[PDB]
């Protein structure tokens, strides 16, 4: 097989990149907001279905190195091929050039990965959009990037992708400030919970929060924790 699954369109596009963006629209919603000394990725999980084992099943936030997290929206099945490439590149960087990867280098790699499956024959793009966030090593600047299935990469101050992202994005213009992040880690978490409660709704059990602090500390806050943070927002509102 060497026949195209990418047929050029007279519109100034490729159909399959437009189809791949819709597929991303229909995916679960991710928020990213970076503090002054943290990153915070909040993601919706549909836990609406009952008798779900949640212990054994991976969160929709995957660590790809000891200080770079990747969250995603769109085709869940497809995403895992990207996560396996990216973990592999992370070691290769240590092998041949030494030190851990930079968030930028890894983001670029991801960018070239999704890009490839557009331009090559025999393959269709991936309809998966990533939020790549993290720290560079020896550094303490949070750097929050977004890559999208067009194979276009971006830096962002805060971003959201997924379902009904627009509703959260308008909220984020108005409650997060370009000039000032919220400075405590805790307030940043609650700003993102407060944002999540627009579309997600339906109790606080469909909210999951991963917080990363520099020096390679990725911890994910449990349901119990969230429960306390949500109730606060609830009372104050």
């Amino acid at each position: 097989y060497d026949r195209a699954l990418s047929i050029f369109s007279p519109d100034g596009h490729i159909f399959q990149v437009e189809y791949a963006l819709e597929a991303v629209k229909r995916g679960t919603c991710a928020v990213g907001v970076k503090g002054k000394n943290c990153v915070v990725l909040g993601c919706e999980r549909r836990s609406t279905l009952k008798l779900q084992d949640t212990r054994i099943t991976p969160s929709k936030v995957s660590k790809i190195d000891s200080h770079v997290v990747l969250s995603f929206s769109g085709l869940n099945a497809d995403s895992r091929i990207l996560i396996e490439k990216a973990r592999v590149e992370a070691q290769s960087h240590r092998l041949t050039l030494e030190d851990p990867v930079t968030v930028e280098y890894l983001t670029r790699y991801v960018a070239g990965v999704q890009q490839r499956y557009t331009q090559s024959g025999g393959v269709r793009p991936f309809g998966v959009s990533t939020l790549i966030a993290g720290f560079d090593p020896r550094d303490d600047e949070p750097k929050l990037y977004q890559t999208e299935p067009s194979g276009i990469y971006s830096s962002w101050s805060a971003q959201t992708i997924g379902r009904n992202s627009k509703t959260v994005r308008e909220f984020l213009e108005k409650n997060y400030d370009r000039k000032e992040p919220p400075a405590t880690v805790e307030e940043c978490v609650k700003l993102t919970v407060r944002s999540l409660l627009e579309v997600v709704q339906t109790g606080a059990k469909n909210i999951e929060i991963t917080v990363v602090k520099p020096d390679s500390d990725i911890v994910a806050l449990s349901s119990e924790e969230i429960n306390q943070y949500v109730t606060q927002i609830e009372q104050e509102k």
Binding site: T28, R46, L49, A77
Partner: protein, 384 residues
């Protein structure tokens, strides 16, 4: 006392009016007795009986005409006695004299079984705010449909031509259908409504005569508002392929461009089109100035759906139990036809009980049936 007050005035007046006209029938003929009475005698003798129906093909300006009768024989008749030649002109049905055929007058005209589908017999009993909410994308349909009929004054100040046309587009169930019938109640001018599935036919040539007609009637009985409901239906519906197909679709489209506009200089025919296949139309259709302000509708937001759900639950029996706001929580960027089907289904739960009450339990149960429809022609579960 609040119904009665209305009734007491209006009934007594319809009873008097009726009675008035009985005594009055006789009274019509009294101010004359030879001043008009005599005139009537003169016209009648001329006419005699039967007055033979003809069809007038064409006039000649020497006081004659060529009729072709539906009984076969053509006749070179004379336009004589009690007739204006300005009420004559192709298409007329005429009264002929049963000895020598002279056109004594024109009184007969005969309606089509296609102008019967077009013309409506109702005035809409529902009015506006029966899907209300998204009530700022409705002043793009009442500042260009309602208002230049209501006020010439505003568009005289600014001068120039006043508005012309709208294309309504968006998700299905987001009110498009009711929008059109809600402006026709307020304006009260001739409301034509045609389905697009009737513009697609299984016979050629008659396709174009139908589409050419709608605006010709429309300009005649001006002002008119022509609702073309569903112009998304022109490329998805088609019968056979040998009197259907490309050819028949292309021709009806071509026809419709002359009508709107075109060269006709017909009557007022504001246009309202509902669609959601807007890219199966021409660039000379979605051309500006046959569309002016165009209206996009998307799915309502969370606080909009609270406007929608309180319209619908006013007509229903209520309790202190009922809580609207948690029904809102569950639905997330869904149509107000979805929300209209839960309230219609909630009384289906009341009907099923045979209990006259409607409770919070009845609204939540039918919300589960409404969400069953959405995700079960789905079979992915969680997005694969």
């Amino acid at each position: 006392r609040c119904k009665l007050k209305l009734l007491r005035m209006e009934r007594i007046k319809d009873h008097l009016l009726l009675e008035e006209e009985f005594v009055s029938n006789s009274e019509i003929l009294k101010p004359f007795e030879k001043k008009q009475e005599e005139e009537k005698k003169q016209l009648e003798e001329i006419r005699g009986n039967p007055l033979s129906i003809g069809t007038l093909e064409e006039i000649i300006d020497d006081d004659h005409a060529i009729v072709t009768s539906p009984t076969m024989p053509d006749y070179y008749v004379s336009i004589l006695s009690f007739v204006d030649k300005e009420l004559l002109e192709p298409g007329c049905s005429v009264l002929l004299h049963h000895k020598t055929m002279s056109i004594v007058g024109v009184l007969q005209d005969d309606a089509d079984p296609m102008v019967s589908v077009m013309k409506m017999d109702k005035s809409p009993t529902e009015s506006y705010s029966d899907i209300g909410g998204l009530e700022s994308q409705i002043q793009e349909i009442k500042e260009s449909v309602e208002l230049p009929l209501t006020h010439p004054e505003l568009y005289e100040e600014m001068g120039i031509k006043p508005p012309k046309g709208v294309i309504l587009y968006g998700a299905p169930g987001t009110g498009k259908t009711l929008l059109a019938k809600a402006v026709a109640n307020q304006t009260s001018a001739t409301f034509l409504r045609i389905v697009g599935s009737e513009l697609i036919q299984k016979y050629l040539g008659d396709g174009p005569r139908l589409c050419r007609q709608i605006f010709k009637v429309a300009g005649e009985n001006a002002p008119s508002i022509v609702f073309i409901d569903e112009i998304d239906a022109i490329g998805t519906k088609r019968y056979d392929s040998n009197s259907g197909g490309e050819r028949e679709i292309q021709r009806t489209m071509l026809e419709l461009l002359n009508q709107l506009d075109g060269f006709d200089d017909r009557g007022d025919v504001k246009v309202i089109m509902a669609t959601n296949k807007i890219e199966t139309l021409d660039p000379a259709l979605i051309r500006p100035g046959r569309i002016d302000r165009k209206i996009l509708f998307e799915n309502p937001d969370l606080s909009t759906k609270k406007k929608i759900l309180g319209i619908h639950t006013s007509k229903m029996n209520l309790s202190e139990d009922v809580n609207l706001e948690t029904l809102v929580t569950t639905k997330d960027d869904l149509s107000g036809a979805d929300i209209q089907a839960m309230c219609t289904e909630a009384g289906l739960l009341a009907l099923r009980e045979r209990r006259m009450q409607v409770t919070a339990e009845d609204f939540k149960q039918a919300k589960e049936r409404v969400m069953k429809n959405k995700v079960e022609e789905n079979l992915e579960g969680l997005y694969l």
